[PDB]
Design a protein around this nucleic acid. Structure first.
Ligand SMILES: Nc1ncnc2c1ncn2[C@@H]1O[C@H](COP(=O)(O)OP(=O)(O)NP(=O)(O)O)[C@@H](O)[C@H]1O
Ligand SMILES: Nc1ncnc2c1ncn2[C@@H]1O[C@H](COP(=O)(O)OP(=O)(O)NP(=O)(O)O)[C@@H](O)[C@H]1O
Ligand SMILES: Nc1ncnc2c1ncn2[C@@H]1O[C@H](COP(=O)(O)OP(=O)(O)NP(=O)(O)O)[C@@H](O)[C@H]1O
Ligand SMILES: [Mg+2]
Ligand SMILES: [Mg+2]
Ligand SMILES: [Mg+2]
Lengths: 308, 308, 308
DNA sequence: TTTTTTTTT
């Protein structure tokens, strides 16, 4: 959460750092989490300056070994914003964690984006309501974004819908290339003030299209790396939770399978494979999380969305 | 396990050696396993000093020929920490060996990191339980680290979870560049006191990302060499076991394949290709080990992890 | 096989020769195969002494022209130790030759080191079994050395595993710089008593690591020359067979390729490009040998290793 | 001389 001015100290020129701001960096942790070469790669830099930028970075951010008990206390610290549905929350154990990544597995008609709206509303909630209390930025590629729904879950909780719209920042994307731009813009938006949650219903979606198969292939994946990694960094510098929604290919052989292949799957700190039962009610089975036993349970898609 | 003070003998200045500590070295074996040039490359050194540092190094560490029977007795000596599952242990023949390297082959949802937590817990175990009795340092790039799980396998065995957290040292990485830093920090952490196991769930993971293809390529590989080699040295100076977890590309042609290419594969003293069957149960097929016939067998992923 | 005492004759001081022993030389052939300058370069020498050392060297070792029929008879003389597998032996025409060099081409998981263990066991065998009857010294950089396996192929043939361990001398290396040291140590070990085979699974391996690219490059190669040449000399003074195992880079362009570049390839008297089929069975294609037509054939990796 | 990346439906 910490501005580089605190690194803008101990003799570094302000100017070059101001150049650094342009590249994307804004946190002290940015350099604390900076790849060395990539910081060197900004022009208007002498490498030794990068070296001492690392010096002050290390100086204000520990990155060495720490005791297990400590990190254990940090795992106490995670506010983990609630779904707004008690029993997904019991599935997720207190809801989606702060500073992590999430996945939506589904065909269509599932309401996964609907989940994402309900989350975007509930993030404003005071922690006693299970919220994280932070402004929310939402990015949609299909443009489905439903401020109406924001007003709806606002009606579910009574905080003014105008306050709901006070947060949630929506920019319509299109390129995979635009996404990263939205990400750095997101960063600059961040250090201004605390945010709760990043949402991307369709982080996968653009890649099927900008890249028409195949090979590419690698190149397609090659960009998600550059994409997905950044997401981590954001969560790594604010604790901001991260939600990813994936369109799922049909599997063919002799089924589903998430798109974006393995490279998404490794970054995938957690996974949620959704399904449709009768009615609003839909089935939610967990995959891939250290936090949790694999399991499943139902949740409804009400006029105010996720609940019972 | 032997501090350089024992080399800090027979006339060498303490100071220059204190400079050597800074470069990374801490063991007598470090110089006993030192490349010549690289020791010379530390500043504040005259080369002849390096020469006589080799003199005392050889003086306290044999590096010449030895009888096969002797090394055979050392192969009796390997405690080889058990998995906590008897039948992987029968696959691995008494579990993962001390002072070696290991590999996790899997897609996602496999529990390979889960294996790594269970190992991190079991390392504390007395040798009769198949443990090595040593403090454990765990490094995670995806941050999945699950102290909860540590408490869990603690419940599996009853040693206090607080004791479990007494060991296992966790530092969150990010750069490939940070990794090596964590490694030297690891060394300094080592010579302080005995450790059992190094774990890295995602030693491969950062390289896909810091390096976006291609070429690079070589450079990417070029770093893993510098990385992987160090791991050996650690195991070569403490007997500390080493676990590597690799994210696996999809293979495309007309399948899986481990990432990091050949250069990982050569260092790979052993390999474990994992798969998902139904339920907690997952399939474990061995690759690439002098120790073992190639084979496979099942193991479950319980609430306390690896077992039956 | 001939000690310098036979050169320690016709008036040379014993002392200076004793100094020569220190530099590395031990055979009469050493000076018979000595570079002039390098012998002069030992201190405590007057050049004329080197001159007359050449005089006695020539005096006890012919180095002039000889008839083709004679060398043809020597090509009858090569015992060429068998693989322990009849059909590699038919590939290699009677197995690996005495006093030559060999190469392992493979990715990983190939069993090339496994071949090297099986060879190390079979060298003890009486010539009727296709062995050379000699003690075997094995050097491993990755430490994979498997005395267990020695006992295993011992079980394959029934000579006591204790006798197997009576030979095979194992020293763990690490530097490229250490290697040469192990080589001179090897020499001193040699003239003591006859040996069959030198083995180095990983003569290439250390160079990727001690030298991080590039340039270096030349320097890297520069050392292998100094390395590989010595190997020849050993084989040139004992008939000891020489086995080299090479880790193979991925080739990239628009494949494999052996590492160490051309300079290894020229010394390479022979080459064996290995591959993996199904099961224990692996594919062996010959490259680069005057002796042989280029060809390939299968061989299995049994519990007792190379065979059918 | 060094050096693999990458699923779609
Ligand atoms: N006001 C509402 N009341 C009840 N159900 C609603 C309401 N609004 C939307 N839904 C349901 O929410 C779902 C909307 O589709 P949804 O699955 O959210 O799109 P998606 O998951 O993004 N699939 P796609 O749009 O193809 O990418 C449907 O099941 C709708 O019936
Ligand atoms: N308490 C638990 N009880 C049972 N199973 C569990 C429990 N916690 C985790 N698991 C299982 O362990 C696995 C966790 O995913 P895992 O394969 O360990 O991540 P991973 O191997 O690192 N893949 P990735 O995270 O994408 O790099 C899943 O199969 C979970 O269902
Ligand atoms: N007892 C055994 N029975 C059957 N096969 C075995 C046995 N021991 C080892 N192997 C096989 O031998 C091979 C061991 O790997 P190997 O290729 O020898 O290492 P390598 O060639 O040196 N590659 P690397 O270790 O990365 O440098 C694998 O195919 C094992 O399955
Ligand atoms: Mg949706
Ligand atoms: Mg895992
Ligand atoms: Mg081998």
């Amino acid at each position: 959460p910490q501005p580089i001015s605190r690194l803008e100290q101990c003799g570094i020129n302000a100017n070059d750092v101001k150049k650094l701001e342009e590249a994307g960096f804004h946190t002290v942790e940015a350099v604390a989490y900076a790849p060395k070469k990539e910081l060197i790669n900004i022009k208007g830099i002498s490498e030794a300056k990068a070296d001492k930028i690392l010096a002050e970075a290390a100086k204000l951010v520990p990155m060495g070994f720490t005791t297990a008990t400590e990190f254990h206390q940090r795992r106490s610290e995670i506010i983990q914003i609630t779904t707004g549905s008690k029993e997904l929350d019991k599935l997720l154990q207190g809801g989606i964690e702060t500073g992590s990544i999430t996945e939506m597995f589904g065909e269509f008609r599932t309401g996964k984006t609907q989940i994402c709206h309900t989350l975007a509303v509930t993030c404003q909630l005071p922690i006693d309501r299970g919220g994280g209390e932070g402004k929310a930025m939402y990015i949609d590629t299909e443009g489905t974004f439903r401020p109406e729904r924001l007003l709806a879950v606002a009606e579910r909780y009574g905080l003014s819908g105008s306050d709901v719209l006070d947060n949630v920042a929506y920019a319509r994307a299109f390129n995979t290339d635009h996404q990263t731009q939205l990400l750095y813009q997101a960063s600059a938006m961040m250090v201004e003030s605390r945010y709760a949650l990043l949402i991307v219903d369709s982080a996968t979606a653009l890649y099927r299209t900008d890249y028409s198969g195949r090979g590419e292939l690698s190149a397609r994946q090659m960009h998600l790396a550059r994409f997905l990694r950044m997401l981590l960094r954001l969560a790594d510098e604010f604790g901001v939770a991260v939600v990813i929604t994936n369109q799922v290919v049909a599997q063919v052989d002799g089924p589903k399978k998430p798109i974006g292949g393995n490279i998404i799957a490794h970054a995938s700190t957690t996974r949620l494979y959704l399904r449709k039962g009768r009615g609003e009610t839909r089935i939610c089975q967990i995959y891939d999380s250290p936090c949790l036993p694999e399991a499943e349970a139902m949740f409804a898609i009400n006029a105010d969305g996720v609940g019972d």
